[PDB]
Amino acid sequence: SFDIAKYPTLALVDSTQELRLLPKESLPKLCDELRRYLLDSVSRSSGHFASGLGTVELTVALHYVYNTPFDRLIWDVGHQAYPHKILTGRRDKIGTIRQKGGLHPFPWRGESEYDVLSVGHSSTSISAGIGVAIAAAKEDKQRRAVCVIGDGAITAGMAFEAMNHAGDIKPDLLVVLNDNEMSISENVGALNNHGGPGTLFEELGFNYIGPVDGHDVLGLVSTLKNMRDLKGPQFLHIMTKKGRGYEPAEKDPITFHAVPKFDHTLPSYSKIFGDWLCETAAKDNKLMAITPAMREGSGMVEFSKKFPDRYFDVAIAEQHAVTFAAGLAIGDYKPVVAIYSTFLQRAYDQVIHDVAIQKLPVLFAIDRAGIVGADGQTHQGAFDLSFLRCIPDMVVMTPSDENECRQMLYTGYHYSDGPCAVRYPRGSGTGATLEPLASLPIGKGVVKRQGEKIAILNFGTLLPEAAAVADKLNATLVDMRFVKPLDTALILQLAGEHDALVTLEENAIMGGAGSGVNEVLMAHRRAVPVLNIGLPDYFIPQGTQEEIRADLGLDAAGIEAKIRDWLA
Amino acid sequence: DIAKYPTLALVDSTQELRLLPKESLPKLCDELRRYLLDSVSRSSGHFASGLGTVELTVALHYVYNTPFDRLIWDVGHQAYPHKILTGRRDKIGTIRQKGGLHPFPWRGESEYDVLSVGHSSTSISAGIGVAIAAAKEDKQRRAVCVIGDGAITAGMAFEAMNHAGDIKPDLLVVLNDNEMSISENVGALGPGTLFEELGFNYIGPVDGHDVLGLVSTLKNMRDLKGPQFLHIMTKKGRGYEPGLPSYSKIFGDWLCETAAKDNKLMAITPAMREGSGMVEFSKKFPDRYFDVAIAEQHAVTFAAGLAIGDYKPVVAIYSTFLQRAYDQVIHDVAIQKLPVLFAIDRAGIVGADGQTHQGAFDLSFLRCIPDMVVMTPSDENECRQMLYTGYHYSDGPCAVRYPRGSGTGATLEPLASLPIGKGVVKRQGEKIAILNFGTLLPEAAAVADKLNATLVDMRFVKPLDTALILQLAGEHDALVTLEENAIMGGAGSGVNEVLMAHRRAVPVLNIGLPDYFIPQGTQEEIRADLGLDAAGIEAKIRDWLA
């Protein structure tokens, strides 16, 4: 049922062993067909478009020259790995990618022996590649090791750490730099600007080759076959064009980075946040805003245009983003770090050591909190309420709608005693009225409904579901607003007035907001059970945000069901 | 006082220092060096690092207009001369003591301490933020930081340099190159080529013990625009020619013993060979010992690669430094289901190093991550048993966390895998059950007999012995949890969650670290102050039950 007529050469390729059976003279035609196949298949599945178009020729060359899967190939991030999957046994399922029950959005160890490392977060390729290259030397067979890392990903500190270590330990590893002059938006940094274009990499201890034409499959084959045989850390710099082969994408690589389903022939919280940045900077000279390479995702495009000298993209450097903000605060400016919950994991030590321990007032605006949807396990905003909660002198807010979100950003922005964090999900609010801004009382929740027997303590954007449940069970419903500090007096009062409590968060149950409530009740030697509703103790799989929420029982029907089963 | 150190007598503030003639700065450096050798030889601490920054510290405060101009010390272990010159001369003898001067520069302690340091490599990053603000302030404030050759190996520092080379802040970075961090710096490291390529104006390397040369050099570079990099060379220790087994030694002994017969074992440290007890290991199995420099991130992800290659990696890392590798643990080990063993030293209270170094959170931030096994040994035998257990546990990563200092002398039994997620009942009592996670067990044992309580060694923070917890809850009026970790999100909070999930609202007293960064002192003092000895544990229970 695969169009052999349209794809006569690709048809003969369903495994890399078949691929290596072709004569090199046919690899160009196969590249044209892979690209054609990708173009309409991703057109209908939605997802990462221009990235894969940019690696077609590279992927063909790599699997033609390397004896995969014995030889180990690691793709960084994996946003560019659709051709990789198509050539490695998943040709006829590429259309299901990013869908519930379909191919993982990125390479996944459990999906194929061809996926050496599960990826999603960036810049892990070189680090893992070194480990597998050292192992391969010890194994003393002739196993080869190669990774592909983007010009954006290579700005991360861990890529520098790995490159420096390779130059010392000298592993037999090939690093392919897929240089397309792009991150998601345009790439930044002193490296991005950097006679020898490989002078830096040679200083780090690598044998540098290039730059070379990343869309020249036969040249890549000849050059890769050579470098595969070379000893020690090797570094091949290729140039690709993002969206190569599709002019709209070649002209707008940002827009076509992640596409909806298209024919190739309400305010979001991100936008609520960026709008609040513009409106604050407009009347306050102290506001400064920081992103680690996520301008478009965090909603900062308009802000960057209107206030260019207040906007800072530090490249893919979550760590520096935070300690840079601490520096601005030390110099009496008011910095805002915009950062996804999942990527905030990488700057945890800077939060603790360079902000909380310092009592510096940095505002953290944590986007993609909770279930993120089709990006799946590697990207989930699943743990910030838990890992932030345990750090002393941190304020942690969970807005329930777009107005609460603005009131909390404003609150944290003007809170000068120490760090504040405001976390919100990907997607749109309720249409709530945007009221005038004033600081909310710290650590105080808001009663929304008075019932009996059961009280629901909601933390975050799942409030509408709790409200529908509250009405059906005649429950009391409170919007806690603060994960830290908790409204202790409120918790104690409703415990004395109900037989059972329920907590609701879009965050891991273990150590989360509801666990903090448990701790308060225990600390006061109470004897009221609490049903902690939140994320289960496994990494959340891919799907529609609404799909996965229903699947985990985080909708009104699932919450009511959970409560009833728990009450015997 | 004055007779011994005449020039030092005159400078109790940097304002006076900058009024001295240049010609007298060398004499000042000798007295400052002598003054150092008297006080730290009787107070302990990081004095050899300070001996090597004597001239640089004098040159910096002489040239820059501190405290208006902003100077940032990386780590802070080389900043005793700094504290001495910034009004704390007479209290330097108290450094690292309970209620003394902080071990490292601390903002709350002096307007001359621009950034609290302890963790390494933060200086450049903060220095860029300070420099950007100083430019917008438009008042000619200068910015300068000092980072060592070890600290500049961290990813953090590269990201800052990459940013500064693009954005071009008015910042001086002084590379204080002494050829080794704690141990010899091991990494790829024109000595200026990297920094020039990253966009800096590079000068040096110069003689870091030539105070007049540094003065003149720093005067020039302080007035240059954009990112400036001064490479200096110093000698570590410039001026001075030179019980029971700790858990670090226990782990190192286990390492050597396992590697002796198992060629698959690989041991990794981010530049903490001595602290983590791996010196003998490193001499005995050099081709399977990996010091990745001060790069906790790469440490973990390299181990993932070794495990993908069917080798058996062990990552030795302090709890406090493990914070900087959190994303690699989650994304590159736990999401991968890869069986990396984490040997987590300085768990709990670390003592004199104070707030920046406490092992205060690993039970909390590890426990919320799916597919992690977290083990808290109560003694040195249990620690060997648990390292063995994790080493041979193939389904996923395992973490074994233990405190700085010595164990109890427990008998070291033959090694066998421990049943996963199961506690050991140590004492059957009445009314109350104490559930211990880790090395406070003996304190808990004293309380349990005093109160005629049940006592359990929980062993696993994750997965918890759910069956045991529920049985305990049906047999007692109250439970008590104990751990050397933040109460918030900690191990006992884990127990709370199991009881709530089963609707077993039996009250639980969570004993652990309170919600503030723990200050400096001896581990014993601080444990007593926090009520984590037997006397404090009993009083907590009694107060809570009244």
Ligand SMILES: CCC(=O)c1sc(CCOP(=O)(O)O)c(C)c1Cc1cnc(C)nc1N
């Ligand atoms: C699905 C793709 C994706 O999440 C991408 S992709 C990309 C540009 C890379 O540029 P490139 O390497 O292609 O040149 C960024 C910045 C991100 C988000 C991100 C941010 N921070 C970390 C540690 N990890 C990330 N993944």
Ligand SMILES: CCC(=O)c1sc(CCOP(=O)(O)O)c(C)c1Cc1cnc(C)nc1N
């Ligand atoms: C108080 C002294 C101290 O803890 C030192 S000191 C030093 C060598 C630096 O070498 P140097 O920079 O002087 O050349 C290390 C490696 C450490 C431990 C450490 C490890 N990891 C981080 C992120 N932070 C740290 N602080």
Ligand SMILES: [Mg+2]
């Ligand atoms: Mg790119």
Ligand SMILES: [Mg+2]
């Ligand atoms: Mg060469």
Ligand SMILES: [Mg+2]
């Ligand atoms: Mg050094």
